[PDB]
Design a protein around this ligand. Sequence first.
Ligand SMILES: CC1(C)[C@H](C(=O)Nc2ccccc2-c2ccccc2)[C@@H]1C(=O)O
Ligand SMILES: [Cl-]
Ligand SMILES: [Cl-]
Length: 134
Amino acid sequence: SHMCDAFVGTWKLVSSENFDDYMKEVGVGFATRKVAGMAKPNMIISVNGDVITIKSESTFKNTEISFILGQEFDEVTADDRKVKSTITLDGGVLVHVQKWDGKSTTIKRKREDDKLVVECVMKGVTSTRVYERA
Ligand SMILES: CC1(C)[C@H](C(=O)Nc2ccccc2-c2ccccc2)[C@@H]1C(=O)O
Ligand SMILES: [Cl-]
Ligand SMILES: [Cl-]
């Protein structure tokens, strides 16, 4: 009974494009990029009232965030950046902005056919991560 209902469920990574370079731009070192780049994370999205929870389990790291749309929160990312995060819903698309050390990256999640498509942008580096229902 929510707009994020399209996103609710368990999703598994099925394809990746340009992710190594996105990780490099975000400050991930060589060894961490090599290991992290092998991973096939899941994405588990749930809603309880106004609280949205996004969990990611993988060999690299398990993470979990809970948030209210529009409200900034602290996040420690899978690659150990300590960031200030705001997530909003803009015309059906979940838009996640992460700010740290004067830098910023945007991760958008959208439903496209049976897929959940994730676009990751840092400066002029864009990566696409495609998920399907688990
Ligand atoms: C882009 C999305 C939404 C998550 C995320 O925050 N990923 C990362 C972002 C920066 C650095 C590393 C990762 C990462 C790499 C491997 C495994 C887990 C996280 C999902 C993903 O599909 O990777
Ligand atoms: Cl590193
Ligand atoms: Cl872990």
